[PDB]
Paper text:
The Ets transcription factor family consists of 28 genes in humans containing the evolutionarily conserved 85 amino acid Ets DNA-binding domain, originally identified as a viral oncogene (E26 transformation-specific). Furthermore, a new Ets dimerization interface linked by a redox-sensitive disulfide bond is identified, and this dimerization is shown to result in a significant inhibition of DNA binding, potentially linking Ets transcription factors with cellular redox regulatory mechanisms.
In all the DNA complex crystals, base pair stacking interactions between neighboring molecules allow the DNA to form a pseudo-contiguous helix that, in some cases, runs the entire length of the crystal. A comparison of the structures of Etv1, Etv4, and Fev in the presence and absence of DNA allows us to identify conformational changes that may occur upon DNA binding. Dimerization of Etv1, -4, and -5 is mediated by the homologous cysteine residues (Cys-416, Cys-422, and Cys-449, respectively). Similarly, dimeric Etv4 and Etv5 also bind DNA with affinities that are 2 orders of magnitude lower than the reduced monomeric forms (note that the Kd values of the dimeric forms are rough estimates, as saturation could not be reached). DNA complexes of dimeric Etv4 and Etv5 migrate at a lower mobility than complexes of the monomeric proteins, indicating the presence of a dimer of Etv4/5 with one or two bound probe molecules.
Residue numbers in the entry:
A (entry chain V), B (entry chain J): 341 to 434
Amino acid sequence: LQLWQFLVALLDDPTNAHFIAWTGRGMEFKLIEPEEVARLWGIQKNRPAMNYDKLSRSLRYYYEKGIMQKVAGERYVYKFVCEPDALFSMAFPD
Amino acid sequence: LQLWQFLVALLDDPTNAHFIAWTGRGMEFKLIEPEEVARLWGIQKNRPAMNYDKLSRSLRYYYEKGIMQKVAGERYVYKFVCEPDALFSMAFPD
DNA sequence: ACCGGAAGT
DNA sequence: ACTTCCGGT
DNA sequence: ACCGGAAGTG
DNA sequence: ACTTCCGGT
């Protein structure tokens, strides 16, 4: 499982909406409890020392892959990119 | 490779523009020469008797998964859906 | 061309 | 995760 | 918080 | 494709 795959898994389950949920506008999501999310992702890839400062780095790595952008001004809020280039790197991550 | 991945791959190479290309209207794409795409897709799956009548069926299958929609009235034209529901189906196809 | 149910891999 | 068939629109 | 350039990763 | 570290604004 990749990071975005795991995030979608949490975003799709309504019982996680108290620490992570879709905003409603397009493909935009917010990390209500950023450390709660980082902890679960730490359990996933078995990285017990995983924090939000390290998880946000990978989200910033998605900027170069062009599959994510930072919603400026809104804290803990990111979004997926609606472009063919985004869907390309999505299907094939080199 | 899944069908939606195979299409994007062809859609990225500009030397395929005579039988498949994006339109510019967001995530909208057109299969200019359907049977040519079905031939190349039939090769991928080692099913040589593949045609557009069966490829388009899997495209209509993608409707229920929510990752695709038909641009009505526009012949050979489909599009990708930019919504959380679709993004969930790409991360978890079953 | 496009649709969508049903049976199959 | 599509493939195969197909009658209706 | 958010950024991102560098080195290490099984 | 991240993880770790951290000195940037």
